[PDB]
């Protein structure tokens, strides 16, 4: 490359392949995405992401659009949170730090929702964590400018809703803090009906009681089984009262019901989080 004196792949991304790059004019370690294509639009919408700045965001540190290829440089960290919770699979990840990383990560929602910018596919590979306490989100407003793991899916999505709305976020979060809590994750999927029907073994078939026009949903069909709904208790033990009520709202079937991001800052799970330092293994 021109401008990166040397260029590792990481893997295989969401949007192309990432690599470990070194910037050839300062030495900056970074990031690199190759957006795999064959859209001046995206260029732009994607530009302005440039701008925000949270400690709970990764940078968007520039988008290079040359040689008719297109490469967003973004701040490198040193392991994701799919990572982390392998390595911390015999132990578990003290419920400290499960609370911290889930606090700071409401705060780069409550930001980025803030700012009118939604994530839509958070998942564990897209968290990314340093050696400081610190948990942050990529890729934030990539996928309104662009236009596969489902486990973290708001059911809206797999019932072919195709209007977003920052619930879709709450949803994948919550999702992320029960695997933490459990070790295992919450709804994995292997398709989108057997994804859908994951979560409705869990959390009963949703009906127009719980969720006013469901059954009017593009994918909605009325031959749905109807399951029950199981306690959170089964769920995700051992997580206290607190826990349990925080995830509840935020995995309601209809996402005008589930919390906010800035509510969930306020919920009383966090009356008495706090900043611990991780054990990571680089
Ligand atoms: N070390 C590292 N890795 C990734 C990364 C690498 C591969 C995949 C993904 C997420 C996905 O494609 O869903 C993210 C970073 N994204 C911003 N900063 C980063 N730093």
């Known amino acids: 490359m021109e401008n990166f004196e040397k260029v590792e792949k990481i893997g295989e991304g969401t949007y192309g392949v990432v690599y470990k790059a070194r910037n050839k004019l300062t030495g900056e370690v970074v990031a690199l995405k190759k957006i795999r294509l064959d859209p001046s639009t995206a260029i732009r919408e994607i530009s302005l992401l440039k701008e925000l700045n949270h400690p709970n965001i990764v940078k968007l540190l520039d988008v290079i ?4 290829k297109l490469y967003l440089v973004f701040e490198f960290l040193h392991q994701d949170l799919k990572k982390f919770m392998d390595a911390s699979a015999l132990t578990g990840i003290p419920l400290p730090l499960i609370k911290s990383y889930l606090f700071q990560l409401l705060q780069g929602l409550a930001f980025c929702h803030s700012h009118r910018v939604l994530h839509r596919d958070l998942k564990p590979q897209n968290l990314l964590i340093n050696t400081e306490g610190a948990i942050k989100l990529a ?3 990539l996928a309104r400018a662009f236009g596969v793991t489902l486990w973290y899916r708001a059911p809206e999505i797999l ?4 209007y977003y709305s920052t619930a879709v976020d709450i949803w994948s979060l919550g999702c992320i803090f029960a695997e933490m809590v459990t070790r295992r994750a919450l709804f994995p999927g292997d398709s989108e009906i057997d994804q859908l029907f994951r979560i409705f073994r869990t959390l009963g078939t949703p009906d127009e ?3 006013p026009g469901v059954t009017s949903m593009p994918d909605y069909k009325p031959s749905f089984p109807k399951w029950a709904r199981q306690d959170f208790s089964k769920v995700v033990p051992p997580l206290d009262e607190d826990g349990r009520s925080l995830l509840s709202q935020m995995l309601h079937y209809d996402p005008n019901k589930r919390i906010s991001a800035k509510a969930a800052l306020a919920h009383p799970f966090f009356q008495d989080v706090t900043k611990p330092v991780p054990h990571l293994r680089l």
């Open 139 to 141: 890729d934030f407003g």
């Open 159 to 162: 019932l072919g809703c195709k």
């Open 209 to 211: 009681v719980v969720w």
């Open 65 to 68: 659009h040359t040689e008719n």
